[PDB]
């Protein structure tokens, strides 16, 4: 018997639209991923990236989290 499944589920998007102008966004994202993958789920790492951009120095950056259908926390567990 046929079973129903959500058409769209378990997505998360992180979006930067900042002019150009490595790039500031990508560098900052790599840094926060390197530092917090061990202890924070991906959504929280995205928030932390935003926090680091809170003070608009130079060209303002505020990358959005979009279209989230994650039902669970995505931890990278680096080392595993």
């Amino acid at each position: 018997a046929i079973k129903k499944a959500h058409i769209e589920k378990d997505f998360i998007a992180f979006c930067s639209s900042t002019p150009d102008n490595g790039s500031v966004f990508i560098g900052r994202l790599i840094e926060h991923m390197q530092e917090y993958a061990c202890s924070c789920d991906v959504e929280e790492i995205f928030r932390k990236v935003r926090f680091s951009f809170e003070q608009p120095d130079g060209r303002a950056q505020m990358p959005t989290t979009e279209r989230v259908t994650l039902t669970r926390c995505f931890y990278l567990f680096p080392g595993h």
């Binding site: 997505f11 998360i12 639209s17 150009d20 490595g22 669970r72 995505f74 931890y75 595993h80």
Partner: protein, 166 residues
């Protein structure tokens, strides 16, 4: 270059939330895949400098997070579509627990600029299309698995500040 998670921290994370974390697959058997599409050279838009540094950084990071990284460069919206449909159909997803998609290009409100984009003749990959090609119908191998999409689509339309006095 990634700070490692200790087995203690891993269990501490698992204790704080019961069945609220995405399951990870065996390190020795899993085939994690990531795709980077970077548009650096365009027909009608200025060259994206720092692209090579960006590709390098993202590639090294995703590898160190356990992913095999595919790198595609200077594609039209049509080429990106073809590349994404192929990526969704990759056999490695069945034995993977997650994926990353990274887009680095120019953008408009609707989506991501292909190499041939101009105001007179649009070359645009819609954001809708990325999710569609990777959804449960078109990509059942990644059903119930986290799909992280990172989009750097540079816009003149980008926010944006307001000036104030104290």
């Amino acid at each position: 270059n990634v700070k490692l998670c200790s087995l203690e921290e891993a269990q501490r994370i698992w204790k704080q939330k019961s069945a609220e974390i995405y399951p990870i697959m065996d390190k020795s058997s899993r085939t994690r895949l990531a795709l980077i599409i970077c548009n650096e050279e365009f027909d009608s838009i200025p060259r994206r400098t720092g692209a090579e540094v960006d590709i390098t950084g993202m590639t090294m990071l995703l590898q160190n997070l356990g992913y095999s990284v595919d790198v595609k460069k200077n594609l039209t919206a049509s080429d990106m579509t073809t590349e994404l449909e192929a990526f969704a159909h990759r056999p490695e997803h069945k034995t993977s627990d997650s994926t990353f998609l990274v887009f680095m290009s120019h953008g408009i409100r609707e989506g991501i600029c292909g190499k041939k984009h101009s105001e007179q003749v649009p070359d645009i990959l819609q954001l809708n299309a990325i999710f569609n090609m990777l959804n449960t119908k078109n990509c059942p191998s990644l059903k119930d698995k986290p799909k992280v999409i990172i989009i750097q689509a540079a816009r003149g339309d980008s926010p944006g500040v307001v000036w104030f006095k104290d």
